[PDB]
Scaffold this motif. Structure first.
Motif, PDB file in Angstrom:
ATOM      1  N   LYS A  44       0.902  -0.901  -0.455  1.00 51.32           N
ATOM      2  CA  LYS A  44      -0.108  -0.614   0.032  1.00 51.32           C
ATOM      3  C   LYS A  44       0.958   1.434  -0.241  1.00 51.32           C
ATOM      4  O   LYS A  44       1.938   1.096   0.732  1.00 51.32           O
ATOM      5  CB  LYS A  44      -1.220   0.293   1.340  1.00 51.32           C
ATOM      6  N   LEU A  45       0.287   2.305  -0.743  1.00 51.10           N
ATOM      7  CA  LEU A  45       1.168   3.940  -0.810  1.00 51.10           C
ATOM      8  C   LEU A  45       1.001   4.055   1.058  1.00 51.10           C
ATOM      9  O   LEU A  45       0.428   4.185   1.037  1.00 51.10           O
ATOM     10  CB  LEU A  45       0.330   4.508  -1.930  1.00 51.10           C
ATOM     11  N   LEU A  46       2.483   5.216   0.854  1.00 53.86           N
ATOM     12  CA  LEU A  46       2.742   5.535   1.613  1.00 53.86           C
ATOM     13  C   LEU A  46       2.029   6.960   1.377  1.00 53.86           C
ATOM     14  O   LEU A  46       1.237   7.142   2.779  1.00 53.86           O
ATOM     15  CB  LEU A  46       3.706   5.839   2.492  1.00 53.86           C
ATOM     16  N   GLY A  47       2.432   7.735   1.244  1.00 49.18           N
ATOM     17  CA  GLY A  47       2.350   8.942   1.123  1.00 49.18           C
ATOM     18  C   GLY A  47       1.687   8.947  -0.597  1.00 49.18           C
ATOM     19  O   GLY A  47       1.967   9.899  -0.844  1.00 49.18           O
ATOM     20  N   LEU A  48       0.076   9.030  -0.611  1.00 43.70           N
ATOM     21  CA  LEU A  48      -0.575   8.686  -1.584  1.00 43.70           C
ATOM     22  C   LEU A  48      -0.736  10.184  -1.857  1.00 43.70           C
ATOM     23  O   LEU A  48      -1.461  10.306  -3.200  1.00 43.70           O
ATOM     24  CB  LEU A  48      -1.685   7.511  -1.381  1.00 43.70           C
ATOM     25  N   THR A  70      10.725  14.068  -6.119  1.00 44.69           N
ATOM     26  CA  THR A  70       9.793  13.254  -5.476  1.00 44.69           C
ATOM     27  C   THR A  70      10.008  11.552  -4.744  1.00 44.69           C
ATOM     28  O   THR A  70      10.143  10.880  -6.174  1.00 44.69           O
ATOM     29  CB  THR A  70       8.532  13.102  -6.151  1.00 44.69           C
ATOM     30  N   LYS A  71      10.733  11.608  -4.373  1.00 46.52           N
ATOM     31  CA  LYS A  71      10.482   9.917  -3.478  1.00 46.52           C
ATOM     32  C   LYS A  71       9.124   8.881  -3.435  1.00 46.52           C
ATOM     33  O   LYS A  71       8.273   9.672  -2.442  1.00 46.52           O
ATOM     34  CB  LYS A  71      11.686   9.568  -2.776  1.00 46.52           C
ATOM     35  N   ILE A  72       8.691   8.104  -3.836  1.00 44.32           N
ATOM     36  CA  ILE A  72       7.640   6.997  -3.228  1.00 44.32           C
ATOM     37  C   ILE A  72       7.920   6.076  -3.027  1.00 44.32           C
ATOM     38  O   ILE A  72       8.942   5.064  -2.992  1.00 44.32           O
ATOM     39  CB  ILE A  72       6.817   6.816  -5.037  1.00 44.32           C
TER      40      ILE A  72
END
Length: 81
Positions: A44-48, A70-72
């Motif tokens: 699941k995405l952290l900082g969606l 920007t890092k994902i």
């Protein structure tokens, strides 16, 4: 022009180069996640969300106004195969 984005999975970093603002966030994530990242089905995405924006998926790269570096972050486990 296209907006690059870096994706870190575990302890490494991978720069994305192919997606453009004409596309969407889900198109970039689902793209890189398929290369080395992990599918959203398990992870699941952290900082969606960014800059107060939801940046779910229907949002465009240039719509979120995020930086190129920007890092994902992705939390989960790789496919079972």
């Amino acid at each position: 022009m296209a907006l690059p984005i870096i994706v870190k999975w575990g302890g490494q970093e991978y720069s994305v180069t192919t997606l453009s603002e004409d596309d969407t966030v889900l198109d970039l994530k689902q793209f890189l996640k398929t290369l080395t990242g992990v599918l959203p089905e398990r992870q699941k995405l952290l900082g969606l969300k960014v800059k107060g924006k939801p940046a779910e998926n229907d949002v465009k790269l240039g719509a979120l106004k995020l930086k190129p570096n920007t890092k994902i972050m992705m939390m989960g486990t790789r496919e079972e195969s």
